[PDB]
């Protein structure tokens, strides 16, 4: 870790000019943008002042977007190799030479120094040996840029960087042209610069232009990853502390909520509603450790004074003694879940469904905790002092979680509330979450009247298979969390499929008269059983499908947007609370138990149907799926299909590469936009044939007289805006 380290921890506004010629055609152009090092995102709008570039824009992409590469985002293992924030408060200076494949070179000198509050860049360019009827200078480079990668070597000699690289530029006619790059980076002011080990970044690009202008100018838009040396593979510092702190709160509040859990009843929900909105508004204000420990701090603050209502005389003051009690439980526990869920869900970036199945894990375990050391509790020292008992067990582990958790720190988002509550996907998503809820409320009462009226037993068996569903939940939460994780497009069919279940289990409980099926102990039991299991097979993936979704749609990542869909989490579990036992007591009153479930699980199943149908009607991604791959004697035939997912094969070109065992990717063919034009390589020419099919959205690649140097796995590659690759297929010929 360094100083300059603490410089980037922000938005950098950034400038860049160059001034170069090519040929003795001079231009000089100027841009401004933003940086941000958080996240590895850049952003410029670059316009030119001398008029007409002779040299296409994707030639500069490289010097300009490439110029700043101080905002690459490092992993934990790899700020010890981090360079660029190491000289940048006085400046460096980088070197590149560019050799374009059959057509001359680039030379730039440039100069990345830290005036005032700004960013600048100063870059000057020299280019030799130029063919008029070139890809450069005959303007024949497409106007788009593809992914890659830079790999970065250190030089003691000089104690700075060396670099190397490719960029295969697309060209109009169907094929590519080569870009080999060799820079060499340098300190100027003699800081302490870290002299790194090989490593190597990843680099996501994206080229736009602004409509309202009517210069010529460029929108660049860059991602940047860090790696090439893996991890230890075990934990940091921060991680294992927000699980002990997040496992001792979670085990805490729920043995809380085990020991002791109509106008104050709805009114709750009413609340808690609005408490979870507003912390979800505004949370970056307050902050996640703040309201951590505050949430804890009320929380064990109604649990002591709730064994105070003994010794509060009947009256107003009794009312609005546990008025407050109630609205502070709630306030207490919205504040405190959606600061635990966002906090987790910003510790843990990739495994998110795991951590959040584990503390389920945990919550249960807690829970079964509860009868021998309660009981005791109870006849060991009373009534009154259990609660206070537990009061002074939780206001003692407070403090550790003041000590323990780290401070994150966050700005103001750009979108608000509205705009991520009417994405109809979101939408789906809460009308799912308040069928479970609803149908959770509405086997809350009526189990205990069913098992009283029918079986003639009192409400310790009720209690105990409350037990066994809850035990049912807690095995079932973190493998199918775990599942959700490892595997993306198995995560929505999860959602399904554990509303269709539940829908299931309800019909299953109320036995039809219709369907001629009778009641009896253990079929109930272990129904509710399963019940629980479909319960905890759907509610863990839907926290990682609303994120997903959220930066689907376009949301900046940050602590604004895990802050938004926590609370909106906590608001749909609320207001399910809410409209479950109502419409259940209602149900039961009006015409019974029998119909109620019937009615509930019919809600529930008409839920994953609309939800099933949304998925079945709206979607579309883009996919390369291929096939073709065999074993074929030398001089014999194949054809090889690729088949899209998600665009029109007439409007975008298609490329195909391939790629030996112990070698490098090599360019094969391409075949352009309007279907007359075809590109090859002379390893090829002749015997390749390249074919597109717009009916049925293919693209095909046949070949004959084969010889044993075409023993490859070959791609297909398209950019739609970014770079999307397929899995390749072998194809080996003896
Ligand atoms: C009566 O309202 C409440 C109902 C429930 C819970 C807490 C309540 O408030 C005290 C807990 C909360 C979560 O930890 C767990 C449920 C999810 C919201 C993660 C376990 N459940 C049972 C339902």
């Known amino acids: 870790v360094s100083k300059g380290e603490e410089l980037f921890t922000g938005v950098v506004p950034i400038l860049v000019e160059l001034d170069g010629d090519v040929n003795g055609h001079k231009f000089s152009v100027s841009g401004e943008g933003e940086g941000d090092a958080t996240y590895g995102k850049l952003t410029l709008k670059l316009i030119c002042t001398t008029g007409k570039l002779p040299v296409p824009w994707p030639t500069l992409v490289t010097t300009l977007g490439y110029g700043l590469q101080c905002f690459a985002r490092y992993p934990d293992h790899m700020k010890q190799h981090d360079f660029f924030k190491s000289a940048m408060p006085e400046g460096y200076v980088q070197e590149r030479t560019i050799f374009f494949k059959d057509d001359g070179n680039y030379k730039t000198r440039a100069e990345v120094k830290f005036e005032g509050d700004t960013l600048v860049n100063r870059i000057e360019l020299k280019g030799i040996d130029f063919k008029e009827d070139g890809n450069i200078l005959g303007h024949k480079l497409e106007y788009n840029y593809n992914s890659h990668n830079v790999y970065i070597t250190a030089d003691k000699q000089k104690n700075g960087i060396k670099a190397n690289f490719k960029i295969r530029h697309n060209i109009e006619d169907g094929g590519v042209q080569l870009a080999d790059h060799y820079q060499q980076n340098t300190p100027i002011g003699d800081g302490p610069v870290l002299l790194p080990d090989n490593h190597y970044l990843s680099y996501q690009s994206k080229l736009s232009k602004d409509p309202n202008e009517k210069r010529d100018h460029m929108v660049l838009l860059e991602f940047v990853t860090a790696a090439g040396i893996t991890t230890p593979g075990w934990l940091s510092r921060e991680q294992v502390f927000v699980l002990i702190s997040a496992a001792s709160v979670n085990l805490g509040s729920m043995m809380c909520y085990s020991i002791l859990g109509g106008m104050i009843f709805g009114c709750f929900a009413l609340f808690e509603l609005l408490a979870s909105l507003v912390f979800g508004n505004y949370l970056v204000h307050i902050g996640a450790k703040f309201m951590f420990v505050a949430g804890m701090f009320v929380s064990g603050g109604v649990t002591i004074l709730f064994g105070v209502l003994d010794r509060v005389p009947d009256g107003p003051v009794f009312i609005a003694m546990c008025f407050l009690v109630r609205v502070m439980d709630a306030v207490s526990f919205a504040a405190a879940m959606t600061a635990s869920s966002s906090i987790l869900a910003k510790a843990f970036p990739n495994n998110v469904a795991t951590v959040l199945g584990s503390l389920e894990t945990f919550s249960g375990l807690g829970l079964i905790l509860g009868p021998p050391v309660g009981g005791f509790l109870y006849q060991s020292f009373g009534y009154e002092v259990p609660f206070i008992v537990l009061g002074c067990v939780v206001l003692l582990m407070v403090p550790l979680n003041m000590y323990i958790l780290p401070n994150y720190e966050s700005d103001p988002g750009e979108h608000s509330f509205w705009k991520l509550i009417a994405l109809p996907k979101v939408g789906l998503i809460a009308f799912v979450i308040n069928s479970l809820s609803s149908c959770f409320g509405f086997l809350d009462p009526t189990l205990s009247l069913f098992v009283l009226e029918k079986f003639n037993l009192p409400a310790g068996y009720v209690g105990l298979v409350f037990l066994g569903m809850a035990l049912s939940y807690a095995i079932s939460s973190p493998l199918f969390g775990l599942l959700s994780d490892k595997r993306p497009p198995l995560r929505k069919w999860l959602l399904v499929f554990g509303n269709l279940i539940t829908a299931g289990c309800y019909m299953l409980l109320g036995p039809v008269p219709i369907l001629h099926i009778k009641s009896q102990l253990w079929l109930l039991v272990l129904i509710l059983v399963v019940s629980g299991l479909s319960a905890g097979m759907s509610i863990i993936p839907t926290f990682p499908e609303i994120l997903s979704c959220a930066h689907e749609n376009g949301f900046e990542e940050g602590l604004s947007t895990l802050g938004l869909v926590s609370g909106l989490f906590s608001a749909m579990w609320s207001i399910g609370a809410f409209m479950g036992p109502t419409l259940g007591g209602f149900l039961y009153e009006k015409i019974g138990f029998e119909w109620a479930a019937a009615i509930q699980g019919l809600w529930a199943l008409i839920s994953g149907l609309a939800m099933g149908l949304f998925y079945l009607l709206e979607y579309s991604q883009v996919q390369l799926v291929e096939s073709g791959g065999a074993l074929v004697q030398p001089g014999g035939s194949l054809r090889l299909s690729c088949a899209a997912s998600?665009?029109?094969?007439?409007?975008?070109?298609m490329r195909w590469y391939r790629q030996a065992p112990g070698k490098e990717r090599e360019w094969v063919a391409g075949?352009?936009?309007?279907?007359?034009?075809?590109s090859y390589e002379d390893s090829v020419k002749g015997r390749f044939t390249i074919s597109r099919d717009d009916a049925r959205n293919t693209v095909y690649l046949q070949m004959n007289s084969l010889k044993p140097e075409d023993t490859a796995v070959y791609y297909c590659?398209?950019?739609?805006?970014?770079?999307?690759w397929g899995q390749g297929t072998q194809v080996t010929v003896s």
């Open positions: 590659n398209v950019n739609v805006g970014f770079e999307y």
């Open positions: 998600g665009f029109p094969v007439n409007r975008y070109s």
């Open positions: 075949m352009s936009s309007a279907g007359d034009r075809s």
